[PDB]
Amino acid sequence: SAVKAARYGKDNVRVYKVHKDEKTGVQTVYEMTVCVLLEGEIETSYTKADNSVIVATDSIKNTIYITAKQNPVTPPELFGSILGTHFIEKYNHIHAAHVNIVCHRWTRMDIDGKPHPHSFIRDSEEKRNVQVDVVEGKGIDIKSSLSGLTVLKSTNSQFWGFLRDEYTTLKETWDRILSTDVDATWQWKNFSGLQEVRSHVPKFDATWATAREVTLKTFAEDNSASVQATMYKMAEQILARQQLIETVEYSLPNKHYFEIDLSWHKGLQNTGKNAEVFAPQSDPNGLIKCTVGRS
Amino acid sequence: SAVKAARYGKDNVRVYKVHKDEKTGVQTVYEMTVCVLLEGEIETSYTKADNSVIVATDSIKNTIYITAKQNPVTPPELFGSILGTHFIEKYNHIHAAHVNIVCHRWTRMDIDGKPHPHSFIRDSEEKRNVQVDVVEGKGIDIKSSLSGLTVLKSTNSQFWGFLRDEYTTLKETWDRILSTDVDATWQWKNFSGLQEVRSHVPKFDATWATAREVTLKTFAEDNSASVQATMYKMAEQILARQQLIETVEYSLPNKHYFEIDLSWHKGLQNTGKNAEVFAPQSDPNGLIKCTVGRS
Amino acid sequence: SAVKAARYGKDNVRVYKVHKDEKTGVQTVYEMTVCVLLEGEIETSYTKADNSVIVATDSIKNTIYITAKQNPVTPPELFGSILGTHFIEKYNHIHAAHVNIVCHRWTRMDIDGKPHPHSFIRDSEEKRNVQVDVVEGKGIDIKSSLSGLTVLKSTNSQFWGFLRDEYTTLKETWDRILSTDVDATWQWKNFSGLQEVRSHVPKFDATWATAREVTLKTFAEDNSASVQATMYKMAEQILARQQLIETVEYSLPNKHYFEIDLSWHKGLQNTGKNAEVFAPQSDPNGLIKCTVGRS
Amino acid sequence: SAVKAARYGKDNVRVYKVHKDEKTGVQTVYEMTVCVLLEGEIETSYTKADNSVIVATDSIKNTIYITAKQNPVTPPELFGSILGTHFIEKYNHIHAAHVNIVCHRWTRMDIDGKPHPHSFIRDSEEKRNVQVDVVEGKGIDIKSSLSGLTVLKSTNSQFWGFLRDEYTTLKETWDRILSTDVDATWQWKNFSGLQEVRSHVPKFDATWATAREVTLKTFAEDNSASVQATMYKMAEQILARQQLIETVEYSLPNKHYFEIDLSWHKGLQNTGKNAEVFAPQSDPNGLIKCTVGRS
């Protein structure tokens, strides 16, 4: 037997950082959960009880905190690139570092209509994430995403013209609820190293903002023929607005809201044009995926 | 043996309702999770296999949806009062109805700076809740709350002067992080029935808004001596602003963010005035409670 | 305004303890999550920023670990009584200690049919809990429970003869699935102090074992007329087997499994006597409660 | 722009099935959660609002229940192969079906030392899973796994000889706690179709049992040099016991239990040989992975 694949490291590392402007008094906070997994010439730790090749996961944890102390933690694409680069440069025998960062929201409070200098609210469980793979001799591969963006529209969603056979019970509809939890990922052109990542730094926040804006506006405004058709429009627009993206991926649950026929009770009309009260379904759920690239 | 207490009903009933203004096209959505538990002359269902006294939980579910179809679902204090009153009026042998409602956020989207007529975002997992106890001959007892309001301030929190003995390791501090998940409850004067509840309807949304506003502003602005001292200020202000409240209760975790001494690594200074990177602690957590009333 | 109620302390304190028999080599592990909340002459911490009355929650945490080091952690009723007694004895101004313990399962592994001396499996997420309220001048009040015991029977559950009116759609049944998550609590006679608790120590494990045995056997063997009728039988049996219990409480969800009519597809018969494939319903769920005492 | 990848279907489909032996009265229950995602000539549903190519996810749900009615649901490898094969055979334009099944435990109760004919306990949240990818022209690729198997050993775990540099604070140890949640996957030789899968049916339950047995015994008996070294031994043993497996993958968190120095309190000794009370750490956690194949 032989080791065909191996990686190891520290997961679920919670990190907070504060920036304090002593001149203005304005403080800004960042909170993340970080995972770093390493690959390299580590097989003997598995096959021969050779711990000499192991950079302890505890040490990886320490390194995450040290790197956050010595560098900006934003944008997460940059921080993850710095962190991953560190491991492959510091340790000859480590040849890849896989850095996942989940960024938690701490939005500055407005109090009596003015932004507060040091108070924040978790205004959504929506996350901004990165997956930064630093692979020695193969640059830096970055996937950026937003996830946990939960939305609903109460009309201007349709679903008709789907295949009908002996397995089909679903009624066609021209007016339904659509709700989802958006998971949207944009995959960057490979970067050659940390200099090239740094050279594009403003594009990371800008592209995240674009992706979010396009997602919301397209969801709100598209009189949707299907989840498939709507999500494709989102992806093509994001690709058109950032040439350093190669692909955009969406993964969207269709979180069903079922009509409730109440006509058995005193002839109450609660379906079709009269539908007001619905049963949100926790499960099951449609799950619709696609990855869009350029032709 | 004998039945000393009993209640039963349907829990975890998800409910959506839409309102459609056909003139303007503006749609408004409401989503809840409802629990209704009944008490009454039901002991023989337990002791004698007498199901004749049981209003089936399935029927309670149906009734929740019917009541939502036939009545406003907002404010939740009103909806819960209507729903609870129904059971004690409809069924002679049912003498209490305990209605819990969790209201989920669906905040209208702004698209290109304009409110969208039918698209919504779950802008926070914060909930607005009610507990409405309709007890035959004893009116309607309502507890309103907000919960899951997660906040952090990066300075202007202190904790010194606490008891120090042989069990104490905690250092005094004059500048720390404070973060919590706010659970705040206001208990209304007993209402005699549904007419009296209806007579105060505007006060429910207004008092929720007050409670939220006071919580946020006091958290942001109080240079906090302790969680205890800050939460008391919140409660006393809410009591001063609504005379139909009898008590205000807060339950606040102290979600600790620990300094990380990095001085073992190249003399890095990350404590005290130099503290920038912290370790959020998932557990354990302080838990601080109080109920404030009028003197 | 004035403080009508207050308590505070440390929640979510994870604790592991090992016992090592150096003679035999057999090791035994215990794992808990502990919460201790204190009451007393603490109102000025809320009203006057008086921290002198606060035993820091950090110190309460330290005390939990010290007490676990210096005492048995089993049975949890005893450990909680020791821990609660400590606070009211050590601190003149503290007059109640509220101790909640959740015990996690670490069941010894059998390897090649022999119990292993130091290896364990989390064989269920079922918990054994206590709530120990030590109140100065009022002894020690203990509620013991088991929770998260998830069971299903595939027949020998019925539900017919329930009230039928204009809100009822549920069909009567003489053969259905019954599944629940058992939460069962037994409330002990008040104990005068720690000596009296200690004098009954063997009864704690014995009564937990009885409660579990009775729950399982009654669930399995009762051809159930309703959740109500079955749970009452469990409670009355437990009361008959331990005179130092005053009441037994059950809280049982009815975790519904719905038939699926497939007759629209090629006449497939999957209802009534032909029902084989069912749809487990995540929500909503019936919730059935009762507290049984002696007549 | 163009669709580079797409798949869609129904997720989170809960399924129960009962088998009833009318001769013996013994009933046996199965409960799963199923996901089926399809690929094929579906791009126009995304690009052109062409729903004609969509087999509705609702219909996929119906098909799961119909297939469970008409076929065995065990072993899950077989059920998933039947289900996946159905979609690629029934629909010309569908060319892959990706079937994930999570199997939930319903272990038969023993009551008064005898197996009960129709009562079951969720004896662990451990799962048995499959991932069955049926790809037209490319057979059936099956990955089988066990997950959520939570274990702890209180000694006979070591970790010393790891790399030490300026990022390292971790003390070497020759006696520590090791706890993990086992996720173990075995990847089968490609099968040509459903006949070949059926021809190996007994091997599925047998190999799952082997994997579980080896995991437990190796964990219990290996005086572990590291998670890496122990998990490799598990994988090599499983490969040696089933030649139709190509690889075995483990993913193991190192769920840390930290010593608590109590020497600040009355000289209490709770470290090293005197360590009895530990602090389980919820996060962060080491995460150790490897995939083992044959040389």
Ligand SMILES: O=C1N=C2NC(=O)NC(=O)[C@]2(OO)N1
């Ligand atoms: O039943 C279905 N209903 C759906 N709606 C949709 O937009 N696309 C689908 O493919 C579908 O996803 O859930 N299938």
Ligand SMILES: O=C1N=C2NC(=O)NC(=O)[C@]2(OO)N1
């Ligand atoms: O250690 C403590 N630190 C705290 N901070 C606080 O505001 N009050 C407390 O009572 C305390 O709550 O967590 N105890």
Ligand SMILES: O=C1N=C2NC(=O)NC(=O)[C@]2(OO)N1
């Ligand atoms: O619809 C119902 N079905 C039930 N079954 C039951 O055992 N008791 C009830 O009161 C019931 O609880 O869920 N109500």
Ligand SMILES: O=C1N=C2NC(=O)NC(=O)[C@]2(OO)N1
């Ligand atoms: O700090 C570490 N401690 C560990 N223990 C271990 O068995 N292997 C590691 O690589 C390690 O994983 O968590 N790193």
